[PDB]
Ligand binder design. Structure first.
Ligand SMILES: Cc1cc2nc3c(=O)[nH]c(=O)nc-3n(C[C@H](O)[C@H](O)[C@H](O)COP(=O)(O)OP(=O)(O)OC[C@H]3O[C@@H](n4cnc5c(N)ncnc54)[C@H](O)[C@@H]3O)c2cc1C
Ligand SMILES: Cc1cc2nc3c(=O)[nH]c(=O)nc-3n(C[C@H](O)[C@H](O)[C@H](O)COP(=O)(O)OP(=O)(O)OC[C@H]3O[C@@H](n4cnc5c(N)ncnc54)[C@H](O)[C@@H]3O)c2cc1C
Lengths: 692, 691
């Protein structure tokens, strides 16, 4: 059958652009103001618009044909891509450069990192850990401009990743020559996963145990030249190779490295923090402005990346959903668009809410970090209690960072995966991006701190924060709710579940509950004679749960706080609608936490279910506005079913035929392989003669 | 550095010795655990024989597959079909399926490319052809793939799940005794048709049967796509390669359009629906269309989930036994990650789930064979005994659906989790995770979209609830719905290590969800909503019903198969697994059991302590549970997963073999890298202007 809209008849092929226009027609807010909320104002929006257009327009950058590229071409084109991006280094501010590389990561996660290993990790190490004179030297050798020089970052070993303190590569001081000997003692200590090392890097920042006169001073950082710059040949004692095929991100040339008795000058050790004299005396000064703006910054960047990737796929799935019809139960009626189904709304709309929430947690973290850094600077008289609070605010920021990184990276993975399923078998088309994006994304969970290892540390960290509070230490701003003793007795008490203040309190309750009980058990177990370490091991599930509940509560809090703080009036009700869906959905997913603490009873879960259904419908009405608010052009979407105009089948059929021209019906292997098989001769079924 | 048996090992040298240590702890004969997993000694030797015939065959060697581009995968799949074809003359139906599933532990692309002819096309002409039609197509080369290659065109760009809504039309023309097959719009383009782009000469085309302006619904028609001699497209046929997929690139999925294609009437497959030479349409009742194929298919998928899951769980666990990261005692070596309680939690319940998927597969097959016989036996029928066989059947379909959905999603999850359990090394293509996950996941979308199956199931469970309420009979699978005691049952201080108590907890929670959503449905229908609008209003509830019932089914099936088939030497160790599975399952969905009031908050702490305990008991025997799968290094196909445990040495070797390192510079060094590193400086000059 056929659909009639505005006096005209449509078919399965022609209806989609009309359906999606119909959705746009419902939008009650101006989209520009929703885009200002996501990116923190007008100035930021124009900047992002500028950067996005610069990327998309660049001919060498074009991602349109990347799905069909084998690894050798990904490897080659990433270099050409680097040469093009290299034009902006002269011009860009740090903020511009970071944001340009994150925007570009929406569609090319390989090139960004292949540059990134020099641009951030190697340059980060020489700037972060070298003296001014050491930095300036490497820059004169061409390291800032990537001129006859290309760095990489060699920390990970085949045997050690998470436990950096346990690296086995050694750097042995020899006084006679004033040198370090860099040595890989067994093949287990071979450097591993080193981006750029396989084919690109002339130098590395090598992490090795510092050994002077039989004393082990722990892991430090040494510049080791990997290749003769002139010929790209390996320096003496340097072995390295391409690690080969990865799940994803094949454009990056991750290599292994072995060092055998490689001689470097003492001066190649980076010495801002740890210093070694020409006589072999080792010093490690107090160095108070050690403040790891960088550590928080690295995590805030990844929390934002989770946003930047998620918005693409959630946009693809939702636009598809607005036009895709499957099934109906009316004789006279067309099949229902899947967006109209309440189950499908539950699959996608919370994740749309989740993606907005990811950005607010990145923004809230960067802002809390900025006010806390600014607060330290103002207080010269050093009112000590005040400084102590500013320090624990900063400490708890770093700690909260670990959970946010862990969960927003996992969540981004789940969204890519879910959005793919939501588009059915057309999810499995390489051109709709799900496959490649998922494969590329997933490493974010492993590198920059294993997600599970971060969650267990932060879970231990919360128990230590709670126990130190009980002993009279002040709590950092991020875990202040642990001091709130109104939560012991708190219950819903017939309050409104549509009120953000209530839903906030409910996440404070279950976080506090889990952490106080875990801290109590840790105390029973230590008194019982376990060491601190053995007690934390006994409480591995509880530490993980604490990390999880606290992070969830932080996402909820940051969403509401940022709405209250920065949302213009015309968008505010639609954001609260999003926020309530996020928050009530989250409650619904983890109903047990709420039952067990006694905040809700069996009947209140039913009500929560009804509210999630309700906000699903409120969010669904405005869905085109929420998704168009991301401001992604079709180039960033990079999937036919997700294009702005909504002509899902026309573009998809176009994309397939463009990349797969159909004029020849037989495969390249038809004569060689397929034809010989289909036309094979019959078996010889004679049997040998034998008398009798 | 570590000392074992008075000898020195390092990070590189230890791992083979560590894994041998774990084998030393095993308290059962591993061969009996294999017998349990595969239903006894005979099946096991058949499996062994098959696996070895696959491993040996040089054409099928999968060692270099990860590095292979799409063009290679496509060609290679055909060479592999040629080699696998050597077994068609001799295999039984049992051996052929099994050989094909075993093969798909390592090559998800080839079995499907063969499969579309082998299973889908042949299945349609056998299933829906008359004997004469079948024999005709066999005579033209179909059975033997001689001058003939089939595919299955059902899906259209417009329709996947809603098969009844397909738009492609078959119009009968008496004058010429022909159907006209036609694709009315581009939306109706057949899509995802494996074999079509490059391989297939013929398709089983699903189209609406139109006779005299009467639409008789979707039927099946054989349509020649290509001239056999030249492989060129036939008049009115347009097809093309769909191109890059997330996975399974070896399969040549195509799109197809039909433009007034004429086929003889006799090409319509006429076992159930017949059209005469005058346009007389007949559809006799005909025994209900034999859905053992439909159930049979879901059972296969459940097993496939076991067959893949075992591989990745084995790789991850063997890795976990040798990998040391972090230590707490200043003097000692770093702790092997398998000794971390949180690592145990991530993997050993998945290992348990792996076994459980098999049990549910085996259970389903048995129940379905058993019900099928108790239909033949009842040639003479007594009103009550024919009715419950029918109702046990219906409840088998529903149970099949949830099982397929959740076991396939679980297998995806297992793959993903095992990859993260191996850290960075999980992201190497050579350790299998990336490609397996990319290939596997489509199982969640085809053969019934997993979400659509769940929402059907949960509607079905509600309807069975309403049925019983109104005096209708209950299928065995949903019997717990008739249990009076359940409504007020509580833990009441009973042992959580007792399987029976755990069964009751799961029965209570499933029944609780179903009955409650039934009351909601009745109340909403009373309110005046139509049956279908109320289900839609209850969509959360239908899903939740399906998940809960399916989880419960997995639990009971595990215990039931252990009690039915576990010898004494392995029983305690399988109850340990089963218990871990069931208690971990309770911990993961604690809110359900709090909400029905079976458990109190105090009981949730005890479940957590028991998950911790059963993790320890299962950890001790890990080598036994994983070796029992009986996979050789060829099936593992991952360096860190190898039998000997020499994880670093195999891994460094695999990498270097595939990536010879003798040349330091990339193939683009002169063309691309070298001109960038040594590019000339910017021109800083500024145009002259007096002013
Ligand atoms: C594509 C890619 C590129 C990379 N590029 C670089 C690079 O350029 N430079 C570089 O230096 N590194 C690089 N790495 C390495 C990466 O930083 C590490 O892989 C990661 O930080 C740690 O992983 P691992 O392999 O050390 O695993 P491990 O730390 O050994 O952990 C392995 C598994 O064991 C578990 N585990 C570990 N410790 C514990 C514990 N105490 N308790 C419980 N469970 C535990 C973890 O959860 C994990 O699942 C790269 C990795 C990848 C995948
Ligand atoms: C690799 C591959 C190979 C294939 N090979 C073949 C082949 O050889 N032959 C062949 O005939 N077909 C083939 N297919 C097609 C495949 O069977 C379909 O993709 C699948 O069966 C149906 O999904 P769909 O794309 O039609 O999505 P739809 O049915 O539209 O579903 C899309 C999304 O909408 C949601 N949705 C749909 N209906 C509802 C509802 N009522 N309520 C709630 N949510 C709903 C679904 O959950 C799904 O997430 C292949 C597919 C793939 C991926």
């Amino acid at each position: 059958a056929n659909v009639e809209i505005d006096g005209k008849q449509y078919n399965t092929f022609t209806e989609p652009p009309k359906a999606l226009a119909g959705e746009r027609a419902k939008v009650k807010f101006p989209i520009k103001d929703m885009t200002e909320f996501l990116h923190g104002g007008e100035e930021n929006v124009t900047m992002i618009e500028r950067l996005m257009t610069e990327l998309e327009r660049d001919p060498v950058l074009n991602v349109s044909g990347d799905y069909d590229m084998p690894k050798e071409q990904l490897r080659e084109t990433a270099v050409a891509r680097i040469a093009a991006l290299s034009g902006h280094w002269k011009k860009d501010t740090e903020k511009e450069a970071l944001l340009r590389s994150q925007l570009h990561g929406i569609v090319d996660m390989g090139t960004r990192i292949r540059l990134g290993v020099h641009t951030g990790l190697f340059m980060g190490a020489i700037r972060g850990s070298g003296t001014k004179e050491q930095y300036d030297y490497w820059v004169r050798k061409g390291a800032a401009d990537v001129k006859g020089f290309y760095g990489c970052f060699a920390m990970t070993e085949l045997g050690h990743g998470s436990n950096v303190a346990g690296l086995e590569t050694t750097a042995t001081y020899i006084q006679d020559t004033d040198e370090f000997i860099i040595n890989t003692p067994n093949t287990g200590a071979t450097k591993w996963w080193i981006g750029g090392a396989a084919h690109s890097a002339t130098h590395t920042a090598c992490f090795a145990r510092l050994l002077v006169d039989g004393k082990d001073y722990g892991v430090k950082i040494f510049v080791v030249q990997l290749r003769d710059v002139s010929s790209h040949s390996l320096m003496p004692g340097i072995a390295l190779g391409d690690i080969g095929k990865k799940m994803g991100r094949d454009a990056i040339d991750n290599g292994w490295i072995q060092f055998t008795n490689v001689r470097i000058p003492r001066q190649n050790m980076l010495m801002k923090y740890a210093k070694v004299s020409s006589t072999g005396k080792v010093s490690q000064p107090p160095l108070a402005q050690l403040t790891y703006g960088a550590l928080i910054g690295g995590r805030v960047t990844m929390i934002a990346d989770s946003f930047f990737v998620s918005q693409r796929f959630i946009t693809i799935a939702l636009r598809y959903a607005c036009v895709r019809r499957q099934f109906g139960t009316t004789p006279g009626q067309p099949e229902t668009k899947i967006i109209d189904y309440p189950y499908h709304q539950r699959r996608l709309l919370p994740l749309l809410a989740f993606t907005y929430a990811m950005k607010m947690a990145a923004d809230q973290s960067q802002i809390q970090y900025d006010q806390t850094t600014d607060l330290l600077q103002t207080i010269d008289p050093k009112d000590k209690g005040a400084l102590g609070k500013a320090i624990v605010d900063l400490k708890e920021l770093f700690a909260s960072s670990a959970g946010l990184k862990a969960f927003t990276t996992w969540t981004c993975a789940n969204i890519i995966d879910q959005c793919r399923q939501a588009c059915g078998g057309h999810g499995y088309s390489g051109y709709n991006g799900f496959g490649q994006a998922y494969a590329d994304w997933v490493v974010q969970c492993t590198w920059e701190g294993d997600n599970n290892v971060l969650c267990l540390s932060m879970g231990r960290g919360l128990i230590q924060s709670c126990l130190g509070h009980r002993k009279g230490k002040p709590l950092g701003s991020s875990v202040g709710y642990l001091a709130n003793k109104g939560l012991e007795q708190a219950t819903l008490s017939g309050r409104d579940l549509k009120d953000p203040k209530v839903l906030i309190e409910a996440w404070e309750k279950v976080a506090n509950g889990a952490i106080q009980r875990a801290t109590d058990k840790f105390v029973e177990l230590t008194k019982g004679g376990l060491s601190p370490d053995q007690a934390f091991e006994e409480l591995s599930q509880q530490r993980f749960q604490c990390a999880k509940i606290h992070t969830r509560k932080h996402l909820v809090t940051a969403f509401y706080e940022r709405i209250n703080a920065s949302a213009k009036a015309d968008v505010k009700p639609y954001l609260i609608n999003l926020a309530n869906l996020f928050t009530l959905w989250s409650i619904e997913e983890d109903s047990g936490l709420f039952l067990r603490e006694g905040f809700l009873q069996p009947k209140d879960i039913d009500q929560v279910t009804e509210l999630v259904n309700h906000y699903c419908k409120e969010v669904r009405d405005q869905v085109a506005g929420y998704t168009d608010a991301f401001g992604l052009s079709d180039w960033f979407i990079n999937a036919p079913i997700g294009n702005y105009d909504g002509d899902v089948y026309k573009h998809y059929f176009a994309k397939v035929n463009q990349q797969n021209p159909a004029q020849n019906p037989r495969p390249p292997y038809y004569e060689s392989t397929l034809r010989p098989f289909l036309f094979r001769e019959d078996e010889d079924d004679d049997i040998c003669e034998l008398d009798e």
